[PDB]
Structure 1
Amino acid sequence: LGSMKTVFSPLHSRRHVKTELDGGLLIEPHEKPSRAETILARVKDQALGEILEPEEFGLGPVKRVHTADYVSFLETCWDEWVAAGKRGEAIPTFWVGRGMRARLPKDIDGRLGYYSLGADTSISDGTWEAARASANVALTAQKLVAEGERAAFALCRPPGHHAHADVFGGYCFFNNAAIAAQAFRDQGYGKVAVLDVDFHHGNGTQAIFYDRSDVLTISLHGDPDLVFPHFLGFEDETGEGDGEAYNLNIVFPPDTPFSIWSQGLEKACERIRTFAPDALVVALGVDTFEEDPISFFKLTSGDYLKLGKRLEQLGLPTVFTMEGGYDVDAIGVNAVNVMQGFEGKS
């Protein structure tokens, strides 16, 4: 069996929010620190490969994807919120409704709404530090692969694939997969593919590269007619301008099992083959699991070994970025199964 290195930062635990808006109530958040700790423990248990901490790349590579005003806002948001006298965690209350102007206001409540797409992603002390560490985790995995590793596992937390150039949400702040893909491009890789196997549509990644033909973006996901993110992810979204034909969405209905999901995976792999990229980023979520509380697919733990094996057969330099997966008990087995299948297990 092969080996794969994992990048992990203990600084993820700086993000430890207490509240998530869900069904009209404030609940304990789904995207909790134990997710990364459970995955880490399985990486060690299975001796997957070397575990390393990230290097500090600074904001340069983050700002190749995200706007400067957005990066500034994420660093100051919590200070601005506390200073304005709010007593809860930072949660948007108002946003740019249909018919309103996409215009950045001065007030923190208006700024919060301008930069968000949902109210379930509370911001509090340590969110900036954790988001910075997570992007460095992704950049460190990309450096490992650029320097010669076939693949590397970026154990990111918070996840990234829902963040736009200048919008946070879906538990995401910096788009780690897009940051890694752009780093490949800046280092001379002519074409990069990003494949999103998380249950939810990678709307941030789609938006970031939507008018570009040098980065192919593909996502398999639950039908947004029915699930988050609702307002992107449909199969008719194929790109715009030079990017037309360089975005591919593959949608599935409730209770979809691996036997059908893997048919979409095969279509994605055929699209990657014709694109013929120089590097692959896989935005990996295991909320496709049959026990996941906020998804409706029916993948089993053994199916992740099959997924990893199929991804290896693409024969590409591959960075895996950790996205979702919210049955905390099974998240380690399921995520590491993808890496182990990539390395030849089962």
Structure 2
Amino acid sequence: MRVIFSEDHKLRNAKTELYGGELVPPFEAPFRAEWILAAVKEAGFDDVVAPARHGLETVLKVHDAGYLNFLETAWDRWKAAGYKGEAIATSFPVRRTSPRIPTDIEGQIGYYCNAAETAISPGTWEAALSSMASAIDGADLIAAGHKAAFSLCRPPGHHAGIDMFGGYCFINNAAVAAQRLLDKGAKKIAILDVDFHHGNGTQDIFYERGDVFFASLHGDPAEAFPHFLGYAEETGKGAGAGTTANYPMGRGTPYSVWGEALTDSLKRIAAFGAEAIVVSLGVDTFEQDPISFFKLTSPDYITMGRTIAASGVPLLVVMEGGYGVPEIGLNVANVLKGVAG
């Protein structure tokens, strides 16, 4: 299977992340992509290509235009306003607020943000566009008839909602890939989000849509980021009724339990009739992940990839989270071994 990867991910190299009341170097840092790329190559997936560049046609169908316009100029405006740090929102449109959009950079960064633990830095927009391009080229391979491809996206995407960035994400790469598949002629697509965290951004984008089924397995939002979406009761609204499926799980969840949710999610996706599945793959479900509470082992990733591919429909694997340890690469490569085996 082809691996689509842009060196322009490195343009996202933020200095700071607000974590535990301190500004620390980000968990979502360039070395992640280096370690994942090296491991997938070591496992024999060495057909690595850069994405073609893409404009905004596809992404404008999943993200709000004002939001994208905001991301394009956010850094420039923040710097011009005289602030000394990276661009980090402080004020947020929470309960019982006005729906109006502010005009200044301070107000707009809050309006367009769901989490203050993500700073906008120079190069962030350009990196996010490169990561989107990797997802689009992957989707194009699936549309062209390939049964598997891997888009090594960085920055990740699944916390970016219709008009909000956060959770280290700016453009929802998996949403863009699903949209691309629809634009290329699919009528029904699924996104299966196996990252430890709920894909709240992805859920938001498709919550009222019946063309994309969204399934997520994740740490219970009562106890895990993103905190404010991902409950089992959220099954969709309007045209989206019945096509969101959340599987929240608790501390210490091992594969024997997690895999039962996987089985169920795949049953739901099959009943929906997905023509392809975009897999939002984070390996932060690993027992050693520094910010997560699941207990998957490295061999479980092979089982996971095999089970998802046994759906018998084409897969685009899109990189999301997974932090800290060298095994992030092994774990991603193991998913691909399960898909390809």
TM norm structure 2: 0.99
CA distance in 2, matches of 1:49, 1:219: 29
Q: Does residue 60 of structure 1 match 2:54?
A: no
* Conserved 8 A contact 2:288-2:325: no
1:43 counterpart SS class: helix
Q: Which residue in the other structure is 2:280 paired with?
A: 283
CA distance in 2, matches of 1:102, 1:225: 26
CA distance in 1, matches of 2:187, 2:96: 40
Q: Which residue in the other structure is 1:42 paired with?
A: 39
Q: Which residue in the other structure is 1:299 paired with?
A: 296
Q: Which residue in the other structure is 1:127 paired with?
A: 124
Structure 2's unaligned 5+ residue stretches are none
Q: Which residue in the other structure is 2:100 paired with?
A: 103
Give the ranges of 4+ consecutive aligned residues of structure 1 lying more than 3 Å apart after TM superposition: none
1:328 counterpart SS class: coil
Structure 1's unaligned 5+ residue stretches are none
1:220 counterpart SS class: strand
CA distance in 1, matches of 2:85, 2:99: 26
CA distance in 2, matches of 1:343, 1:52: 18
1:194-343 to 2 correspondences below 5 Å: 194-343=191-340
1:194 counterpart SS class: strand
C-alpha deviation, 1:317, in angstroms: 1.2
Q: Which amino acid aligns with 1:176?
A: N
* Conserved 8 A contact 1:34-1:328: no
1:281 counterpart SS class: strand
- Aligned counterpart for 1:151 among listed residues 148, 151, 162: 148
CA distance in 2, matches of 1:165, 1:97: 16
Q: Which residue in the other structure is 2:10 paired with?
A: 13
Q: Which amino acid aligns with 2:294?
A: F
Q: Which amino acid aligns with 1:70?
A: Y
Q: Which amino acid aligns with 1:332?
A: G
C-alpha deviation, 1:307, in angstroms: 0.3
CA distance in 1, matches of 2:288, 2:178: 31
C-alpha deviation, 1:74, in angstroms: 0.5
* Conserved 8 A contact 1:38-1:328: no
C-alpha deviation, 1:178, in angstroms: 0.5
Q: Which amino acid aligns with 2:315?
A: T
2:58 counterpart SS class: helix
Q: Greater CA deviation, 58-67 or 300-309? A: 58-67
CA distance in 2, matches of 1:144, 1:43: 18
CA distance in 1, matches of 2:104, 2:131: 28
C-alpha deviation, 1:102, in angstroms: 2.2
CA distance in 2, matches of 1:302, 1:154: 22
C-alpha deviation, 1:98, in angstroms: 1.4
Q: Does residue 182 of structure 1 match 2:179?
A: yes
Aligned length: 341
The two structures, once aligned, show a CA RMSD in angstroms of 0.8
1:267 counterpart SS class: helix
CA distance in 2, matches of 1:42, 1:233: 31
1:78-89 to 2 correspondences below 5 Å: 78-89=75-86
CA distance in 1, matches of 2:84, 2:46: 44
2:71 counterpart SS class: helix
C-alpha deviation, 1:49, in angstroms: 4.1
CA distance in 1, matches of 2:257, 2:108: 42
